[model samples]
Target: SSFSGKYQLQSQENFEAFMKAIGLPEELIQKGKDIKGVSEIVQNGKHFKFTITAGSKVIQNEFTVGEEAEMETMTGEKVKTVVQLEGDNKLVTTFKNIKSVTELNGDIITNTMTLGDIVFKRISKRILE
Candidate 1:
């Protein structure tokens, strides 16, 4: 785990479509369109803690790889899910049929979240290093 760091939003692709796929309200979607997010991850062995600051919201969640846990969404909805580090060494998790994969490479952190036919790619770079 050299993946612990603070990442700032750099670019995104099909973010709105991904949000729409998950049925996020239009009001919040607009805010997400123009705002950026910072993701801070602290990892130890199978445990991972994440603090995400997006738009006007800040959420914190913790989980362990390969173990089932309940995590809260941005809207405070708790969802049952399991996170794992897959064969590609990327952190993979799923909830409600949505799959999210996060990979850390040097100073960049890339996340690809998918819901059915919709896929969203987000790129973030270490800004505090």
Candidate 2:
């Protein structure tokens, strides 16, 4: 299994609630709600690089499995964390009390984030050439 393609957002759930729970400013959430984001992932064995873009905001994070690295959260906060790979299809991590899980299945990617009882989920489809 490999996650080495660009995926574009298809749908989302609990976007506003999740953003609010994370303490994002109202204006920023408003600006970001309707925008479709793209995530480009480059993976080579246990090393990975990700570039996530939404509107004018782009966040790039790179890390090797089982090692601690600093990552920028969607709220633009930087946190040091370790990412783990599970069963070759899932990537898991936590930052600032938020838990993240990303699962890849063929040309589809599902990303979920949880803060307390609020869960935000996004489904994206790979941009095929």
Choose the strongest candidate by TM-score.
Answer: 2
Per-model TM against the reference: 0.90, 0.94
Identify the runs in model 1 with alpha carbons over 4 angstroms from their true place. none
Candidate 2 displacement at residue 36 in angstroms: 1.1
- Per-residue lDDT of 3-121 in model 2, one digit per residue for the tens? 99999999999988988887888888888889897889999999999999753478899999899998888778889999999889999998878899999999999999988898899
Q: TM-score of the candidate numbered 2?
A: 0.94
lDDT, candidate 2, at 126: 99
Model 2 off-target regions past 4 Å?
Answer: 54-56
Q: Clashing residue pairs, candidate 2?
A: none
> Best-fitting candidate, measured by lDDT?
2
